[PDB]
């Protein structure tokens, strides 16, 4: 399963108790619409916790769009240990059944929020 790559820089807030999921952009995304492109938008979801749901701005016909949306991981740093965040990129062809071109996730407990977690996250077409 492959969804390309997504660059991001995640930082933590100890005042309001939220992690700042600042992604840069996604590169090399699968096509859905007829034309070799899609309307991929990242829908930030969470495990059982489910205490957060944000919809990014639809990116009409683009497999390498940039925007850098601000996702607020509503959950105390102390709680993050038991919360696995999941970033799924949803399409918005606007005709057929919008499919999940791909997604990515990481065990927050293993994400030592020392300062800022910046890295070139790999994207996978996990049909979940």
């Amino acid at each position: 399963e492959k969804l390309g790559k997504l660059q991001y820089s995640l930082d933590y807030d100890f005042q309001n108790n939220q992690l700042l999921v600042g992604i840069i952009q996604a590169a090399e995304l699968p096509a859905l619409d007829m034309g070799g492109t899609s309307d991929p938008y990242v829908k930030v979801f969470l495990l059982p916790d489910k205490k957060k749901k944000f919809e990014t701005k639809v990116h009409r016909k683009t497999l390498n769009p940039v925007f850098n949306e601000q996702f607020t991981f509503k959950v105390p740093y102390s709680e993050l240990g038991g919360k696995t965040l999941v970033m799924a990129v949803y399409d918005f062809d606007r005709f057929s059944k919008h499919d999940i071109i791909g997604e990515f996730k990481v065990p927050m407990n293993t994400v030592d929020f020392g300062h800022v977690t910046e890295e070139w996250r790999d994207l996978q077409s996990a049909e979940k």
């Binding site: 399963e1 096509a31 007829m34 070799g36 077409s125």
Partner: protein, 98 residues
């Protein structure tokens, strides 16, 4: 020591052969792609080259000369030609290309 690197030509046939194999074994017989199996290749790892994720039937008929509804290894392999062609060719008539 072990895990010795071969020639670039052995590398590249392997990488596509393993990918092929990770689709060939989906259903009955881990050599032949059946119809779904075949469509799964294009729809997943081929969104630009052959952006036609609807007329897979046309490709299938163009490929499976005997129309057994099995692209055997060598029959399936045809696609890789049309790929290796397209990357140069793509629409060298109108577009353009790039």
């Amino acid at each position: 020591m072990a895990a010795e690197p071969l020639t670039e030509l052995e590398e590249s046939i392997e990488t596509v052969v393993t990918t092929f194999f990770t689709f060939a074994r989906q259903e009955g017989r881990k050599d032949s792609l059946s119809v779904n199996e075949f469509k799964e290749l294009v729809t997943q790892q081929l969104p630009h080259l052959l952006k036609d994720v609807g007329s897979l039937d046309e490709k299938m008929k163009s490929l499976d000369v005997n129309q057994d509804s099995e692209l055997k290894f060598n029959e399936y392999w045809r696609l890789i030609g049309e790929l290796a062609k397209e990357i140069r060719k793509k629409k060298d008539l109108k577009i353009r290309x790039x």
